[PDB]
């Protein structure tokens, strides 16, 4: 197989509308926000404007191919792939994607999609001008798929989600932590999972 | 049936431009606004900027399938479904959808669509800084389908309201109206949502 | 015929690129602006920001069907229909459509399309703070079709005007013009809508 | 032929990706800006916000039809036509098109396309508040086609809004040929000088 | 061959999703920024707003044709071509493309793509008001292709810079880097463009 064949095969047989589960085993999605720039902060309205790289990984075995004498990975337009329907629950603006909408697919079916996103959030900005800083929580999970269809999983301490933060920001990052949650909503009996990302930051000196 | 078959069947036989009226009864649509945030308020211009989850439900029996040895629900892109042509009659900005455009479909044909929407409204902001607060009315109904094609009915009032808003919700009431317009002999139904809110302490 | 058939037939045989001129008579288009809100006014720059419902009607006999054993009217996405290429000649922003892009089609081929539009205009704002008010003129006509292809005709001024606006409407008049442009020998029609309004208090 | 046949034929045989160079000759494009409004002006940043009608004409003989017992002209969505890849070289915002995207096509293959555009430009705003006024130059030409593929040629104050803060003193057009490092061939542009001032 | 044939052939056999690597050598991409304007600068937030022409060249031998009895070059919509997935790593707004999205393709398979882009960056603005000026670094490279798939290489600094800008360019230097990410073992290449500029007068 060459790249052209792999990409052709994926395009011709893609079901981007179909979550790649096998009932009742959920697709395990890992989500990790790499903060890049904090652009606007308003302590009066409790709103923040943020740029981050949304590292997103999951496995889709319908995409796998024999890697022998073939490339190990390809870049695929996300329009040809199923992609998890993640949403930021406390977002107050449309997510503005700043990067080419391509995912990286490995021959074993592992997918990495990492868009750079600019987006505005409603969160706690109180304390941003103090040395303790503000703690802004961003809640990300599947909009429509419950825990038996999509499970979302959180970084540990070992993930440094501030390692690409711009040195030229007015702001600086003190800490970034993730908390996994399961929530039940009135509409449905099943629980929905989310990752809660706590961004601890402050205005510099 | 597996998920892929259900979704394939729906996509291949979808008539998204066809209202699923059966027995000439109107399609019964339930609408309910869950307010999440109140972002900007202007008592001089009487304008408000709001984020809400628009809980929308109706039945489309053309989508039903067998719930034995099969999943009970699937997520479907709305581009493959008929969706009610609801509009907010006193909106002054385009509805900005903040969520993936997917609906949840149950095997009996019940559909739930619930986009998160940011939108600006012209409404009564007077009294926002008082104890009694302001009462802003939002009117939502079908743009083009009258009462014999679509009927609308309303379905913790701060259940999902952000604790970090400058504002707080005192009460939300959701009422049903029938209105006749000059163009048509028929009555058009809407839900009128009264949002009573005020600036925090 | 049922709804699904009518909509299928329209979609399958639609020529949205083709003006439905019958014989060599122009398509008669009626245009009428229902003002809903006046949101921003600037007397220094002579610009106004306005929300209106653009009531637009014309006949397309290629869409007609036998109304026996059939619905009387259907809602059709405008992408399946020819729609007149109307433009506001003194607009200074893109028209922002706030409503579902659907037209209402009667079995005799009558079409009604009525989007809610927010748009900014360059017009005379002088006198807005006086008792006489300002008179802002909005010029609407076909961008590319002359008077033998499209003719435009006008058809309570505050009927749907928001009671919460900073402004109020004194009068709305509509008159009809034919203009000849250097490019072409044929005349182009427009409707000129005069909005007489003033700041309250 | 009726209207529907002409439009069907055009749609079915349209090559909107293909410049209609006949006999190996450049397509002659005429460009003319009709200024309608001047909305914002900033003498500190040298930026101007402008609304204009971009009169654009050229010949595409692949579109011609026998006019006998047929309409002489039709309106065609530009998505069905080749259209010159004109750009404003000193623009600093995306062109915002305010009109239906239709061209007018005559039976001999002449095409007229005239969008109303609002766009922001970087140009010389100095002197806007004096009676000599400012002279803002707008440079428009093909982005990718050189002078043997597209040639541009010009062809006043007629539709300018009476309600603008500004007024037009004069509009002149010059025709330039420029060579760029990438290519040996010359690229043509029209330079439009807008002389205007505060009222 | 005529122009129409070349363009037809390219469109009919185009694989825009497929990087044109040959013999498992990376596609060599040349990137060069021609600065046209500096529109807004903020020394407090360290942000800059910039317009530049992104000169981008590479070879795609699948596009080559016999130039005998044929045009040497054509203009092709980029939607019909593979284009490198370059991104500005320190960009804080979406790239706003100001020019027709067309590339120039030579009969030997060389491609030149040069969009005019307006975009905002986070970079060092300190010293903009001094004689020494600020030095703003812009990092551009493939988003998803490593050094064995795409290699990037750089090619008057004020040549196309607008004479009417508040600012002036002192120097522009470009430098290739290889970076390894936690992501992946392979190294990713970028070009780092250093723009040394200052406030006029
Ligand atoms: C179809 O979209 C619905 C489908 C299922 C959901 C559970 C999680 N999700 C977001 C929050 C939310 C709901 C539904 C609800 O009742 O309230 C809030 C939904 C969106
Ligand atoms: C085609 O879209 C029209 C079709 C039918 C309607 C009934 C309610 N609806 C919104 C307001 C409104 C009208 C019709 C009208 O003339 O008055 C105002 C419409 C939209
Ligand atoms: C391409 O669409 C053209 C076709 C015919 C027109 C007459 C009315 N219309 C708007 C004003 C206007 C023109 C053309 C012209 O030369 O003057 C300005 C046009 C647009
Ligand atoms: C592919 O698009 C290129 C192809 C040919 C061009 C000459 C005119 N044009 C605009 C300015 C410009 C260039 C190319 C260049 O290197 O300098 C700047 C181009 C765009
Ligand atoms: C989906 O595209 C990913 C695939 C490979 C990459 C290396 C360069 N690139 C940008 C920054 C970046 C990553 C990957 C990563 O995990 O960290 C940061 C990527 C995007
Ligand atoms: Mg092969
Ligand atoms: Mg692995
Ligand atoms: Mg030939």
Numbering used by the authors:
A (entry chain F): 1 to 205
B (entry chain G), C (entry chain H), E (entry chain J): 1 to 155, 160 to 205
D (entry chain I): 1 to 155, 161 to 204
Can you quote the paper on this entry?
Neuronal nicotinic acetylcholine receptors (nAChRs) are pentameric ligand-gated ion channels present both in the central and peripheral nervous system. nAChRs belong to the Cys-loop superfamily and exist as homo or heteromeric receptors composed of either α subunits or α and β subunits in combination. The mulloskan AChBP is a structural and functional homologue of the extracellular domain of nAChRs. The erythrina alkaloid dihydro-β-erythroidine (DHβE) is a potent competitive antagonist at nAChRs that has been used extensively as a pharmacological tool compound to gain a better understanding of the involvement of these receptors in physiological processes. Each monomer consists of an N-terminal α-helix, two short α310 helices and a 10-stranded β-sandwich core.
In this study, we have determined the crystal structure of Ls-AChBP in complex with DHβE, which is a potent competitive antagonist of nAChRs. The crystal belongs to space group P212121 with a DHβE molecule bound at the interface of all ten monomers in the asymmetric unit of the crystal. The binding pocket is formed by the highly conserved aromatic residues Tyr89, Trp143, Tyr185, and Tyr192 from the principal side of the interface and Trp53 from the complementary side. The protonated tertiary nitrogen of DHβE lies within hydrogen-bonding distance of the backbone carbonyl of Trp143 (2.7 Å, chain D) and is also in close contact with the hydroxyl group of Tyr89 from the B-loop (3.5 Å, chain D). On the complementary side, DHβE interacts with the protein main chain via a water-mediated hydrogen bond. The oxygen of the methoxy group of DHβE accepts a hydrogen bond from a water molecule, which is tightly coordinated to the backbone carbonyl oxygen of Leu102 and nitrogen of Met114. In this way, the antagonist DHβE bridges the principal and complementary side of the interface in a way comparable to that of agonists. The structure reveals three main features that are unique to this antagonist: (i) DHβE introduces a C-loop closure compared to that of agonists, (ii) the C-loop undergoes a conformational shift perpendicular to the previously observed C-loop movements, and (iii) the hydrogen-bonding network of DHβE is similar to that of agonists. Thus, DHβE seems to prevent receptor activation via a mechanism different from that of prototypical antagonists and toxins.
